[PDB]
C-alpha cells in the first residue's frame, strides 16, 4: 500500500504545515501538524475543555462507529517550545492520503496549552518519530507510520515541504519526479527516539565550506533551524545590522537586509537554503526589525533541522530495520 497527502503552510511565514487526516467512521477530517520530532497522534476533541477550544475542528469519538475507548490509557506531552497537552485515548481508523490504519491510537485532548488554543488552524499533531517516545501510559502506543509500515510497498515516508507553497507527505514510496539529482543517505541514531543524524558541515552564502560534524534531528514539527552558537554567529555576521536580542529571544536583522544562503552537508552532498527561507518577518506588526530563521541551539540541548532546512530538500525517512535519512535537492 501507499499514501500521498498535500501539506499546506498555516500562514504566510510557513510557521507550520497542516495535512488533512481522516479519523473514524464516517470520516472526520482534521488538519494535523505532521511532526517527525514526536510520537503522539493527538487531536482536539469533544472532550477538550471548552474554554481551550477556539476555532479548531474537533474529533467526536461518540460519532465514530469504529472508535473504542482504550481503557485506562492516558497521555501527557510537553514540547520544546513549552507547549503541552494531555487526555485519554481511543483506538480508531485513521487514513492519510488513501493509506488506512485500523486500530490506531488516537489521543483525545482534555487539556491543551494556550499556544494550541490560540492557533485555530491546527487540529492536533501526528507524530512520526520513533514509537519509543510515545507518551501513552500504562501501555505505550505505536505511531501511524509504525502501524502502517508492514503494509507499505516500502517502509518509508517522505517529506517535501514547500516554501510559501503546498508540499507533499508520501508513505510507502519514493517519487523520483519530486527531486533533482540523487538522494544522499546518511546514518540515523534512534537512541533518543528521534531521526537523529550528523551533518558534515556548513557554508554561509558563497563562503567556503566548513567541514565539521553537527549532530541534530530532522524535525518537521519545528519551524526554525537551530544550530550551535558558533555556526549561527558565523551566519549572522554576514548580515549588516543583525544582532542577538535577549528581549526578542534570538537573532533579529534589519528588514531591509538581503539574507545570504546557508548550505548544510549531507555526506559529500550539499543542501542549499536560499536566503529568503531564513526571513520570518517583522518581530511585531509594523516593525523594521525581522526575526531570523537560523537560531542558536545553546538553550535547547540539541541541534534541530526544522522546516527552514527541511523545506530546501526532498527528505526520505527510511524506516527499514536499520533506519536512515535521505536528502535530495529539488
Ligand atoms: C504550533 O506550531 C508552532 O507554534 C510552530 N512554532 C512550530 N513549533 C511547534 C512546536 Br510543538 C515546537 O516545539 N516548536 C515549533 O517550532
mmCIF file of C-alpha atoms and ligand atoms in Angstrom:
data_model
loop_
_atom_site.group_PDB
_atom_site.id
_atom_site.type_symbol
_atom_site.label_atom_id
_atom_site.label_comp_id
_atom_site.label_asym_id
_atom_site.label_seq_id
_atom_site.Cartn_x
_atom_site.Cartn_y
_atom_site.Cartn_z
ATOM 1 C CA UNK A 1 0.000 0.000 0.000
ATOM 2 C CA UNK A 2 0.898 3.700 -0.312
ATOM 3 C CA UNK A 3 -0.480 7.084 0.722
ATOM 4 C CA UNK A 4 0.013 10.629 -0.551
ATOM 5 C CA UNK A 5 -1.240 13.836 1.033
ATOM 6 C CA UNK A 6 -0.751 17.542 0.437
ATOM 7 C CA UNK A 7 0.663 19.598 3.281
ATOM 8 C CA UNK A 8 -0.088 23.333 3.447
ATOM 9 C CA UNK A 9 1.576 26.217 5.340
ATOM 10 C CA UNK A 10 -0.725 27.599 8.052
ATOM 11 C CA UNK A 11 0.327 31.176 7.354
ATOM 12 C CA UNK A 12 2.421 33.469 5.178
ATOM 13 C CA UNK A 13 5.594 32.690 7.161
ATOM 14 C CA UNK A 14 5.388 28.874 6.936
ATOM 15 C CA UNK A 15 5.248 28.722 10.754
ATOM 16 C CA UNK A 16 3.882 25.194 10.451
ATOM 17 C CA UNK A 17 2.271 22.850 7.946
ATOM 18 C CA UNK A 18 -1.103 21.092 8.174
ATOM 19 C CA UNK A 19 -2.137 17.896 6.421
ATOM 20 C CA UNK A 20 -5.700 16.568 6.234
ATOM 21 C CA UNK A 21 -6.279 13.304 8.116
ATOM 22 C CA UNK A 22 -9.423 11.133 8.107
ATOM 23 C CA UNK A 23 -10.362 9.736 11.516
ATOM 24 C CA UNK A 24 -13.239 7.405 12.372
ATOM 25 C CA UNK A 25 -16.345 6.077 10.609
ATOM 26 C CA UNK A 26 -17.823 8.043 8.923
ATOM 27 C CA UNK A 27 -14.638 10.026 8.356
ATOM 28 C CA UNK A 28 -13.980 13.103 10.450
ATOM 29 C CA UNK A 29 -11.329 15.139 8.670
ATOM 30 C CA UNK A 30 -8.898 17.046 10.886
ATOM 31 C CA UNK A 31 -5.904 19.120 9.823
ATOM 32 C CA UNK A 32 -2.886 17.829 11.717
ATOM 33 C CA UNK A 33 0.698 19.021 12.135
ATOM 34 C CA UNK A 34 2.896 16.107 10.996
ATOM 35 C CA UNK A 35 5.791 16.108 13.454
ATOM 36 C CA UNK A 36 8.852 13.899 12.932
ATOM 37 C CA UNK A 37 10.103 15.106 16.319
ATOM 38 C CA UNK A 38 7.395 13.461 18.428
ATOM 39 C CA UNK A 39 5.403 10.249 18.507
ATOM 40 C CA UNK A 40 1.903 11.032 19.670
ATOM 41 C CA UNK A 41 -1.128 11.404 17.432
ATOM 42 C CA UNK A 42 -3.391 13.708 19.414
ATOM 43 C CA UNK A 43 -6.443 15.742 18.491
ATOM 44 C CA UNK A 44 -8.744 18.482 19.683
ATOM 45 C CA UNK A 45 -11.929 16.657 20.613
ATOM 46 C CA UNK A 46 -15.394 16.744 22.132
ATOM 47 C CA UNK A 47 -13.549 16.095 25.409
ATOM 48 C CA UNK A 48 -11.336 19.189 25.231
ATOM 49 C CA UNK A 49 -12.031 21.839 27.875
ATOM 50 C CA UNK A 50 -14.475 24.175 26.113
ATOM 51 C CA UNK A 51 -12.627 27.369 27.034
ATOM 52 C CA UNK A 52 -9.482 25.921 25.428
ATOM 53 C CA UNK A 53 -11.047 25.388 22.002
ATOM 54 C CA UNK A 54 -11.061 28.391 19.651
ATOM 55 C CA UNK A 55 -11.926 27.581 16.047
ATOM 56 C CA UNK A 56 -10.359 24.121 15.766
ATOM 57 C CA UNK A 57 -12.131 21.160 14.221
ATOM 58 C CA UNK A 58 -12.727 18.535 16.897
ATOM 59 C CA UNK A 59 -12.834 14.745 16.843
ATOM 60 C CA UNK A 60 -16.034 13.334 18.354
ATOM 61 C CA UNK A 61 -15.436 9.650 19.111
ATOM 62 C CA UNK A 62 -19.084 9.057 20.094
ATOM 63 C CA UNK A 63 -19.967 9.770 16.440
ATOM 64 C CA UNK A 64 -17.496 7.174 15.135
ATOM 65 C CA UNK A 65 -18.777 3.600 14.883
ATOM 66 C CA UNK A 66 -15.194 2.283 14.882
ATOM 67 C CA UNK A 67 -13.976 4.291 17.918
ATOM 68 C CA UNK A 68 -13.152 2.269 21.053
ATOM 69 C CA UNK A 69 -12.046 3.746 24.372
ATOM 70 C CA UNK A 70 -8.618 2.385 25.268
ATOM 71 C CA UNK A 71 -9.457 1.564 28.865
ATOM 72 C CA UNK A 72 -7.239 3.167 31.485
ATOM 73 C CA UNK A 73 -4.934 4.836 28.995
ATOM 74 C CA UNK A 74 -3.839 8.444 29.456
ATOM 75 C CA UNK A 75 -1.271 10.679 27.778
ATOM 76 C CA UNK A 76 0.558 13.902 28.539
ATOM 77 C CA UNK A 77 3.164 15.651 26.463
ATOM 78 C CA UNK A 78 5.237 18.804 26.588
ATOM 79 C CA UNK A 79 7.108 20.141 23.592
ATOM 80 C CA UNK A 80 10.350 22.030 23.037
ATOM 81 C CA UNK A 81 8.666 25.432 22.849
ATOM 82 C CA UNK A 82 6.994 24.911 26.225
ATOM 83 C CA UNK A 83 3.542 23.997 24.925
ATOM 84 C CA UNK A 84 1.634 20.957 26.164
ATOM 85 C CA UNK A 85 -1.476 18.803 26.010
ATOM 86 C CA UNK A 86 -2.998 15.756 27.693
ATOM 87 C CA UNK A 87 -6.027 13.492 27.825
ATOM 88 C CA UNK A 88 -7.262 9.961 27.234
ATOM 89 C CA UNK A 89 -7.057 7.551 24.316
ATOM 90 C CA UNK A 90 -9.269 5.914 21.725
ATOM 91 C CA UNK A 91 -8.396 3.491 19.004
ATOM 92 C CA UNK A 92 -9.965 4.227 15.620
ATOM 93 C CA UNK A 93 -9.435 4.022 11.872
ATOM 94 C CA UNK A 94 -7.042 6.663 10.580
ATOM 95 C CA UNK A 95 -6.331 7.390 6.926
ATOM 96 C CA UNK A 96 -3.730 9.674 5.367
ATOM 97 C CA UNK A 97 -3.893 10.318 1.632
ATOM 98 C CA UNK A 98 -5.508 6.965 0.906
ATOM 99 C CA UNK A 99 -3.406 4.906 3.317
ATOM 100 C CA UNK A 100 -5.518 3.358 6.074
ATOM 101 C CA UNK A 101 -4.558 2.078 9.534
ATOM 102 C CA UNK A 102 -7.124 0.303 11.693
ATOM 103 C CA UNK A 103 -6.759 0.384 15.470
ATOM 104 C CA UNK A 104 -4.586 3.488 15.522
ATOM 105 C CA UNK A 105 -4.223 5.123 18.934
ATOM 106 C CA UNK A 106 -5.963 8.495 18.692
ATOM 107 C CA UNK A 107 -5.116 10.554 21.754
ATOM 108 C CA UNK A 108 -8.013 12.774 22.723
ATOM 109 C CA UNK A 109 -7.096 16.091 24.370
ATOM 110 C CA UNK A 110 -8.806 17.031 27.615
ATOM 111 C CA UNK A 111 -6.347 19.899 28.111
ATOM 112 C CA UNK A 112 -4.214 21.967 25.735
ATOM 113 C CA UNK A 113 -1.875 24.863 26.476
ATOM 114 C CA UNK A 114 -2.665 28.403 25.352
ATOM 115 C CA UNK A 115 -0.493 28.293 22.230
ATOM 116 C CA UNK A 116 -2.576 25.432 20.821
ATOM 117 C CA UNK A 117 -5.826 27.208 21.681
ATOM 118 C CA UNK A 118 -4.616 30.390 20.004
ATOM 119 C CA UNK A 119 -3.817 28.550 16.789
ATOM 120 C CA UNK A 120 -7.152 27.882 15.102
ATOM 121 C CA UNK A 121 -5.572 26.211 12.070
ATOM 122 C CA UNK A 122 -4.012 23.203 13.813
ATOM 123 C CA UNK A 123 -6.411 20.479 14.973
ATOM 124 C CA UNK A 124 -3.746 18.274 16.525
ATOM 125 C CA UNK A 125 -0.404 16.623 15.877
ATOM 126 C CA UNK A 126 0.557 13.408 14.097
ATOM 127 C CA UNK A 127 3.876 12.175 15.446
ATOM 128 C CA UNK A 128 6.356 10.456 13.142
ATOM 129 C CA UNK A 129 9.386 9.989 15.400
ATOM 130 C CA UNK A 130 10.079 6.549 16.842
ATOM 131 C CA UNK A 131 7.378 4.904 18.934
ATOM 132 C CA UNK A 132 9.694 4.702 21.955
ATOM 133 C CA UNK A 133 8.831 8.389 22.596
ATOM 134 C CA UNK A 134 5.059 7.842 22.688
ATOM 135 C CA UNK A 135 3.631 9.133 25.974
ATOM 136 C CA UNK A 136 0.583 6.877 26.386
ATOM 137 C CA UNK A 137 0.515 5.211 29.814
ATOM 138 C CA UNK A 138 0.483 2.462 31.043
ATOM 139 C CA UNK A 139 0.723 0.863 27.596
ATOM 140 C CA UNK A 140 2.849 2.760 25.087
ATOM 141 C CA UNK A 141 1.258 3.059 21.643
ATOM 142 C CA UNK A 142 2.671 2.961 18.106
ATOM 143 C CA UNK A 143 2.836 5.833 15.623
ATOM 144 C CA UNK A 144 0.760 5.888 12.431
ATOM 145 C CA UNK A 145 3.914 5.097 10.435
ATOM 146 C CA UNK A 146 4.951 2.177 12.644
ATOM 147 C CA UNK A 147 1.435 0.732 12.367
ATOM 148 C CA UNK A 148 1.360 1.159 8.572
ATOM 149 C CA UNK A 149 4.933 0.042 7.907
ATOM 150 C CA UNK A 150 4.401 -3.672 7.301
ATOM 151 C CA UNK A 151 1.667 -2.929 4.764
ATOM 152 C CA UNK A 152 3.611 -0.283 2.847
ATOM 153 C CA UNK A 153 5.250 -1.087 -0.506
ATOM 154 C CA UNK A 154 8.448 0.173 1.095
ATOM 155 C CA UNK A 155 8.934 1.022 4.800
ATOM 156 C CA UNK A 156 9.475 4.739 4.159
ATOM 157 C CA UNK A 157 7.803 8.092 4.188
ATOM 158 C CA UNK A 158 8.967 11.299 2.548
ATOM 159 C CA UNK A 159 8.652 14.981 3.400
ATOM 160 C CA UNK A 160 8.520 17.543 0.618
ATOM 161 C CA UNK A 161 7.719 20.837 2.312
ATOM 162 C CA UNK A 162 7.099 23.920 0.204
ATOM 163 C CA UNK A 163 8.435 27.440 0.612
ATOM 164 C CA UNK A 164 5.378 29.686 0.796
ATOM 165 C CA UNK A 165 3.606 26.883 -1.066
ATOM 166 C CA UNK A 166 1.960 23.488 -0.603
ATOM 167 C CA UNK A 167 4.008 20.300 -0.472
ATOM 168 C CA UNK A 168 3.589 16.567 0.000
ATOM 169 C CA UNK A 169 3.911 13.752 2.512
ATOM 170 C CA UNK A 170 4.182 10.352 0.816
ATOM 171 C CA UNK A 171 4.047 6.978 2.529
ATOM 172 C CA UNK A 172 5.427 3.753 1.126
ATOM 173 C CA UNK A 173 7.159 5.059 -1.989
ATOM 174 C CA UNK A 174 9.751 7.474 -3.293
ATOM 175 C CA UNK A 175 8.520 9.844 -6.027
ATOM 176 C CA UNK A 176 11.532 10.091 -8.311
ATOM 177 C CA UNK A 177 9.954 13.068 -10.105
ATOM 178 C CA UNK A 178 9.953 15.171 -6.924
ATOM 179 C CA UNK A 179 13.675 15.913 -6.628
ATOM 180 C CA UNK A 180 16.735 16.680 -8.720
ATOM 181 C CA UNK A 181 19.999 14.754 -8.840
ATOM 182 C CA UNK A 182 20.420 11.883 -6.409
ATOM 183 C CA UNK A 183 19.297 11.171 -2.864
ATOM 184 C CA UNK A 184 22.171 11.022 -0.384
ATOM 185 C CA UNK A 185 21.512 8.709 2.529
ATOM 186 C CA UNK A 186 23.061 9.154 5.952
ATOM 187 C CA UNK A 187 23.085 7.137 9.184
ATOM 188 C CA UNK A 188 20.452 7.573 11.870
ATOM 189 C CA UNK A 189 20.685 7.038 15.612
ATOM 190 C CA UNK A 190 17.406 6.099 17.297
ATOM 191 C CA UNK A 191 18.958 6.201 20.779
ATOM 192 C CA UNK A 192 16.983 9.320 21.761
ATOM 193 C CA UNK A 193 13.892 8.287 19.791
ATOM 194 C CA UNK A 194 14.484 10.902 17.090
ATOM 195 C CA UNK A 195 15.515 10.894 13.460
ATOM 196 C CA UNK A 196 18.987 11.864 14.634
ATOM 197 C CA UNK A 197 21.843 12.239 12.154
ATOM 198 C CA UNK A 198 25.168 14.007 11.670
ATOM 199 C CA UNK A 199 25.609 16.792 9.140
ATOM 200 C CA UNK A 200 29.068 17.036 7.641
ATOM 201 C CA UNK A 201 29.302 20.825 7.823
ATOM 202 C CA UNK A 202 28.128 24.160 6.500
ATOM 203 C CA UNK A 203 28.735 27.229 4.375
ATOM 204 C CA UNK A 204 27.436 30.783 4.608
ATOM 205 C CA UNK A 205 26.471 32.360 1.284
ATOM 206 C CA UNK A 206 29.237 31.881 -1.262
ATOM 207 C CA UNK A 207 31.744 31.242 1.535
ATOM 208 C CA UNK A 208 33.999 28.211 1.825
ATOM 209 C CA UNK A 209 32.502 25.022 3.209
ATOM 210 C CA UNK A 210 33.459 24.259 6.800
ATOM 211 C CA UNK A 211 33.824 20.534 7.427
ATOM 212 C CA UNK A 212 32.554 19.822 10.926
ATOM 213 C CA UNK A 213 30.228 17.224 12.426
ATOM 214 C CA UNK A 214 26.883 18.620 13.544
ATOM 215 C CA UNK A 215 24.629 16.146 15.304
ATOM 216 C CA UNK A 216 20.963 17.038 15.075
ATOM 217 C CA UNK A 217 17.432 15.860 14.398
ATOM 218 C CA UNK A 218 15.231 16.073 11.314
ATOM 219 C CA UNK A 219 12.114 17.667 12.792
ATOM 220 C CA UNK A 220 9.157 18.693 10.626
ATOM 221 C CA UNK A 221 7.353 19.983 13.721
ATOM 222 C CA UNK A 222 9.897 22.725 14.427
ATOM 223 C CA UNK A 223 9.740 25.926 12.354
ATOM 224 C CA UNK A 224 13.325 27.091 12.516
ATOM 225 C CA UNK A 225 16.872 25.819 12.084
ATOM 226 C CA UNK A 226 18.641 25.545 15.459
ATOM 227 C CA UNK A 227 22.408 25.104 15.296
ATOM 228 C CA UNK A 228 25.466 25.608 17.511
ATOM 229 C CA UNK A 229 26.217 29.179 18.585
ATOM 230 C CA UNK A 230 29.488 29.251 16.635
ATOM 231 C CA UNK A 231 27.701 28.370 13.399
ATOM 232 C CA UNK A 232 24.824 30.769 13.975
ATOM 233 C CA UNK A 233 27.188 33.613 14.877
ATOM 234 C CA UNK A 234 29.107 32.972 11.666
ATOM 235 C CA UNK A 235 25.883 33.210 9.646
ATOM 236 C CA UNK A 236 24.515 36.422 11.141
ATOM 237 C CA UNK A 237 27.919 38.131 10.997
ATOM 238 C CA UNK A 238 27.345 38.259 7.231
ATOM 239 C CA UNK A 239 24.186 40.346 7.665
ATOM 240 C CA UNK A 240 24.724 44.058 8.311
ATOM 241 C CA UNK A 241 22.930 45.152 11.456
ATOM 242 C CA UNK A 242 21.995 41.663 12.628
ATOM 243 C CA UNK A 243 22.274 41.023 16.353
ATOM 244 C CA UNK A 244 21.107 38.657 19.062
ATOM 245 C CA UNK A 245 18.320 40.216 21.124
ATOM 246 C CA UNK A 246 17.589 38.774 24.563
ATOM 247 C CA UNK A 247 14.342 40.745 24.719
ATOM 248 C CA UNK A 248 13.129 39.294 21.428
ATOM 249 C CA UNK A 249 14.650 35.887 22.140
ATOM 250 C CA UNK A 250 17.113 35.384 19.314
ATOM 251 C CA UNK A 251 18.778 36.880 16.281
ATOM 252 C CA UNK A 252 16.999 39.730 14.541
ATOM 253 C CA UNK A 253 18.029 41.662 11.451
ATOM 254 C CA UNK A 254 17.025 44.805 9.557
ATOM 255 C CA UNK A 255 14.058 44.041 7.327
ATOM 256 C CA UNK A 256 15.897 45.926 4.545
ATOM 257 C CA UNK A 257 18.656 43.286 4.515
ATOM 258 C CA UNK A 258 19.325 40.748 1.797
ATOM 259 C CA UNK A 259 19.998 37.414 3.525
ATOM 260 C CA UNK A 260 22.770 35.073 2.380
ATOM 261 C CA UNK A 261 22.031 31.430 1.743
ATOM 262 C CA UNK A 262 23.008 28.695 4.180
ATOM 263 C CA UNK A 263 24.421 25.382 2.988
ATOM 264 C CA UNK A 264 24.497 22.190 5.079
ATOM 265 C CA UNK A 265 26.309 18.960 4.316
ATOM 266 C CA UNK A 266 24.803 15.517 3.933
ATOM 267 C CA UNK A 267 27.768 13.236 3.496
ATOM 268 C CA UNK A 268 29.566 14.616 0.445
ATOM 269 C CA UNK A 269 26.336 16.242 -0.785
ATOM 270 C CA UNK A 270 25.178 19.801 -0.114
ATOM 271 C CA UNK A 271 21.720 21.244 0.532
ATOM 272 C CA UNK A 272 21.381 24.975 -0.071
ATOM 273 C CA UNK A 273 18.823 27.007 1.893
ATOM 274 C CA UNK A 274 18.043 30.228 -0.026
ATOM 275 C CA UNK A 275 18.369 33.415 1.994
ATOM 276 C CA UNK A 276 14.628 34.219 1.722
ATOM 277 C CA UNK A 277 13.844 30.984 3.586
ATOM 278 C CA UNK A 278 15.605 32.425 6.636
ATOM 279 C CA UNK A 279 13.347 35.543 6.818
ATOM 280 C CA UNK A 280 10.488 35.280 9.318
ATOM 281 C CA UNK A 281 9.317 38.834 9.035
ATOM 282 C CA UNK A 282 8.781 41.754 11.393
ATOM 283 C CA UNK A 283 9.077 40.839 15.074
ATOM 284 C CA UNK A 284 5.841 42.777 15.615
ATOM 285 C CA UNK A 285 3.415 44.328 13.155
ATOM 286 C CA UNK A 286 4.935 47.384 11.503
ATOM 287 C CA UNK A 287 8.423 46.773 12.857
ATOM 288 C CA UNK A 288 11.520 47.180 10.699
ATOM 289 C CA UNK A 289 13.280 44.513 12.747
ATOM 290 C CA UNK A 290 12.858 40.998 11.360
ATOM 291 C CA UNK A 291 13.190 37.619 13.056
ATOM 292 C CA UNK A 292 15.840 35.212 11.811
ATOM 293 C CA UNK A 293 15.192 31.658 10.694
ATOM 294 C CA UNK A 294 18.534 30.367 11.966
ATOM 295 C CA UNK A 295 18.874 30.452 15.742
ATOM 296 C CA UNK A 296 21.199 29.104 18.424
ATOM 297 C CA UNK A 297 20.514 25.679 19.894
ATOM 298 C CA UNK A 298 22.524 26.541 23.019
ATOM 299 C CA UNK A 299 19.457 26.695 25.280
ATOM 300 C CA UNK A 300 17.766 23.604 23.769
ATOM 301 C CA UNK A 301 20.390 20.924 24.291
ATOM 302 C CA UNK A 302 20.058 19.535 20.785
ATOM 303 C CA UNK A 303 20.504 20.793 17.219
ATOM 304 C CA UNK A 304 17.308 20.836 15.191
ATOM 305 C CA UNK A 305 16.988 20.703 11.422
ATOM 306 C CA UNK A 306 13.493 22.179 11.365
ATOM 307 C CA UNK A 307 11.330 23.335 8.482
ATOM 308 C CA UNK A 308 13.751 26.081 7.391
ATOM 309 C CA UNK A 309 16.254 23.339 6.496
ATOM 310 C CA UNK A 310 13.905 20.549 5.513
ATOM 311 C CA UNK A 311 11.838 22.576 3.024
ATOM 312 C CA UNK A 312 15.023 23.145 0.990
ATOM 313 C CA UNK A 313 15.172 19.393 0.382
ATOM 314 C CA UNK A 314 13.318 16.251 -0.545
ATOM 315 C CA UNK A 315 13.688 14.183 2.617
ATOM 316 C CA UNK A 316 13.378 10.409 2.916
ATOM 317 C CA UNK A 317 12.604 8.907 6.301
ATOM 318 C CA UNK A 318 13.678 5.294 5.781
ATOM 319 C CA UNK A 319 12.158 3.034 8.424
ATOM 320 C CA UNK A 320 13.990 -0.140 7.464
ATOM 321 C CA UNK A 321 15.213 -2.306 10.347
ATOM 322 C CA UNK A 322 18.270 -0.055 10.319
ATOM 323 C CA UNK A 323 16.722 3.385 9.735
ATOM 324 C CA UNK A 324 18.442 6.006 7.574
ATOM 325 C CA UNK A 325 17.724 9.523 6.306
ATOM 326 C CA UNK A 326 17.933 10.655 2.701
ATOM 327 C CA UNK A 327 18.264 14.202 1.343
ATOM 328 C CA UNK A 328 17.988 15.437 -2.232
ATOM 329 C CA UNK A 329 17.922 18.928 -3.725
ATOM 330 C CA UNK A 330 14.733 19.874 -5.537
HETATM 331 C C1 LIG B 1 2.264 25.006 16.756
HETATM 332 O O1 LIG B 1 3.423 25.306 15.943
HETATM 333 C C2 LIG B 1 4.152 26.347 16.334
HETATM 334 O O2 LIG B 1 3.883 27.066 17.252
HETATM 335 C C3 LIG B 1 5.392 26.492 15.472
HETATM 336 N N1 LIG B 1 6.283 27.500 16.108
HETATM 337 C C4 LIG B 1 6.141 25.130 15.305
HETATM 338 N N2 LIG B 1 6.585 24.529 16.566
HETATM 339 C C5 LIG B 1 5.761 23.705 17.296
HETATM 340 C C6 LIG B 1 6.181 23.085 18.407
HETATM 341 BR BR1 LIG B 1 5.041 21.918 19.357
HETATM 342 C C7 LIG B 1 7.525 23.277 18.900
HETATM 343 O O3 LIG B 1 8.013 22.763 19.907
HETATM 344 N N3 LIG B 1 8.275 24.129 18.108
HETATM 345 C C8 LIG B 1 7.882 24.770 16.954
HETATM 346 O O4 LIG B 1 8.645 25.484 16.315
#
